Structure formats: structure tokens, C-alpha cells
Structure 1
Amino acid sequence: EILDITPCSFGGVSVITPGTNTSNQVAVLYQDVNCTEV
């Protein structure tokens, strides 16, 4: 049987932050990954 090899998912993680002087809330952006692998 013939198998495809697809590399496991990966990508950079960037943090969205308003300036700390305003607040400490943070939202995280996972680059180029479907919202299932998370």
C-alpha cells in the first residue's frame, strides 16, 4: 500500500497585546494551523 508522508503541522506563535499600561489581556495567534491541531 502506498503512503503519503505529510509533515506534522507547525508554525509560529504570535501574541496580540495592547500596551501593558492599558491592560494585561492577551490573545494568541497560531500561524497557519487549522483550529483543530491546537
Structure 2
Amino acid sequence: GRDIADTTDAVRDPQTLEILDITPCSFGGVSVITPGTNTSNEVAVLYQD
């Protein structure tokens, strides 16, 4: 298959003709929500996407 921007969104299995979507492996940037180190050292992590 193909997506709008030339991306392999779907493949068909050669041994058995089934249509398989390729959701990409989920990934995202790691951000740290913290106040100042003068105030505390407790952190909160926001995982995006």
C-alpha cells in the first residue's frame, strides 16, 4: 500500500494474501516538568505521542 506522502502504510503477506496495516512503533519525546532546583528536586515526566 501507500499513504498520501509515499509511506508504506500497508503490506500484503506473501504466504497468505491478507492485508496488514503498519501502525508505526509508538515513540515520542520525553519532557521533564519541574520547578526550580533551588525550590525542590521532585520531577514529573510527561510522555508525548
TM-score scaled to structure 2, two decimals? Answer: 0.62
Q: Deviation above 6 Å: which 4+ runs of structure 1?
A: none
Separation (CA, whole Å) in 2 of partners of 1:2 and 1:26 = 44
Give the number of equivalent residue pairs: 32
Q: CA RMSD in A?
A: 0.5
Structure 1: gaps spanning 5 or more residues: 33-38
Larger Rg: 2
**Which structure has the higher relative contact order (CA within 8 Å, separation 6+)?**
1
Shift of 1:10: 0.3
Q: Which residue of 2 aligns with 1:3?
A: 20
Please identify which structure carries the higher strand content. Answer: 2
SS in 2 for 1:29: strand
SS in 1 for 2:19: coil
TM-score scaled to structure 1, two decimals? Answer: 0.77
